[PDB]
Amino acid sequence: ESWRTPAIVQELAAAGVEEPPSRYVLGEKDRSDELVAAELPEPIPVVDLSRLAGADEAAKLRAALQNWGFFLLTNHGVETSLMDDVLNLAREFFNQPIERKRKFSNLIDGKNFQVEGYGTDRVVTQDQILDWSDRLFLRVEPKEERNLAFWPDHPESFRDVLNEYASRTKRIRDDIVQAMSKLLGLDEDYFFDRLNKAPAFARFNYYPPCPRPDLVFGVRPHSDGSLFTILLVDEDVGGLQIQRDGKWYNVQVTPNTLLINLGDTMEVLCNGIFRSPVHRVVTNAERERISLAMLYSVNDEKDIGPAAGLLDENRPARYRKVSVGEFRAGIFGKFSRRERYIDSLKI
Ligand SMILES: CC(=O)C1=C(O)CCCC1=O
Numbered sequence: 001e002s003w004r005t006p007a008i009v010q011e012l013a014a015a016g017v018e019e020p021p022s023r024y025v026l027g028e029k030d031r032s033d034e035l036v037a038a039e040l041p042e043p044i045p046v047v048d049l050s051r052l053a054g055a056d057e058a059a060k061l062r063a064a065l066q067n068w069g070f071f072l073l074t075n076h077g078v079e080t081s082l083m084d085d086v087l088n089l090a091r092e093f094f095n096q097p098i099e100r101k102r103k104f105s106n107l108i109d110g111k112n113f114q115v116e117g118y119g120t121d122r123v124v125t126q127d128q129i130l131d132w133s134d135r136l137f138l139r140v141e142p143k144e145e146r147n148l149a150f151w152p153d154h155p156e157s158f159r160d161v162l163n164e165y166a167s168r169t170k171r172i173r174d175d176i177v178q179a180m181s182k183l184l185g186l187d188e189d190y191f192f193d194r195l196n197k198a199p200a201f202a203r204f205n206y207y208p209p210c211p212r213p214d215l216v217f218g219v220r221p222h223s224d225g226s227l228f229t230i231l232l233v234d235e236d237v238g239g240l241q242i243q244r245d246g247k248w249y250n251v252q253v254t255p256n257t258l259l260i261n262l263g264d265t266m267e268v269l270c271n272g273i274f275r276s277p278v279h280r281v282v283t284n285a286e287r288e289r290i291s292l293a294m295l296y297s298v299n300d301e302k303d304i305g306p307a308a309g310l311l312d313e314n315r316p317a318r319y320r321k322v323s324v325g326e327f328r329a330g331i332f333g334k335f336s337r338r339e340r341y342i343d344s345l346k347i
Pocket residue numbers: 203222223224225226263295335
């Protein structure tokens with residue numbers, strides 16, 4: 001009935017909607033870059049966590065973060081029965097009757113929007129184009145601030161399995177941080193002090209099939225605002241596209257592997273040594289696509305700016321140092337917009 005309450009896309013697709021409603025249809029300029037992406041000209045960066053202390057993988061990790069901003073993590077310790085469980089339980093929640101799922105809506109009373117809960121992202125203006133997907137957005141860290149009213153009670157083991165999966169990726173977070181601290185020549189607890197009691201979120205994305213996969217986005221082109229993201233996809237058939245130098249490339253998170261991409265917070269803190277990739281998801285006609293992304297932010301203690309240990313005489317500050325409040329407002333507000341916030345920091 002109004003633009004502040006957008007529809008659940010899964011139920012639109014399940015209805016057999018003849019064509020995407022105008023609220024999801026892209027403009028002419030945006031539609032010439034999405035229907036076709038190229039393949040990776042260079043093979044996909046892969047890192048083995050079991051030998052990440054070795055000198056060969058560190059060079060592989062450095063090349064990944066400096067040339068692409070993302071990499072596939074293999075041999076990560078997280079058991080496959082756990083990765084399948086958290087994915088299967090996510091699928092069972094999305095396949096519940098809609099009236100059960102609206103109890104966990106992110107529109108409080110069906111009216112006032114908030115981030116946490118089941119739905120889509122914030123609709124700022126009436127003519128804002130919506131993504132062709134829904135997501136279940138939940139806070140996982142710190143545990144004390146967890147709102148269990150939004151954690152699905154059915155299937156009954158969702159809360160325990162998510163809690164168990166989150167602790168496993170948090171340890172992966174700390175192992176990737178220690179390795180990145182060695183590539184930058186910085187001390188470990190520079191990041192850990194900023195990760196202490198820091199926010200972390202779990203985003204369950206559901207990408208329904210679309211009747212016109214050439215007119216919509218599953219998720220808008222964007223870069224994450226976190227420090228970095230740990231992504232898990234359920235039998236990825238395709239859809240994720242990453243941008244480099246204006247050119248879009250297809251990337252496929254193979255099963256049992258975790259994709260880890262850097263966010264905008266890391267690019268500023270490492271003074272642009274490593275990059276934060278702009279990425280998107282495109283739909284297709286037949287099959288739905290489910291992914292879970294673990295987003296790890298920094299706390300609110302230190303300003304968002306290049307690490308002082310990285311600003312020697314040969315390489316000065318390439319970004320401005322900004323307060324944390326001013327940073328999160330820019331990231332949160334520019335997600336629905338075309339321009340990218342972090343570019344305004346470049347000096
Ligand atoms: C933490 C933040 O970076 C993320 C969410 O807000 C929405 C999904 C994409 C990403 O931008």
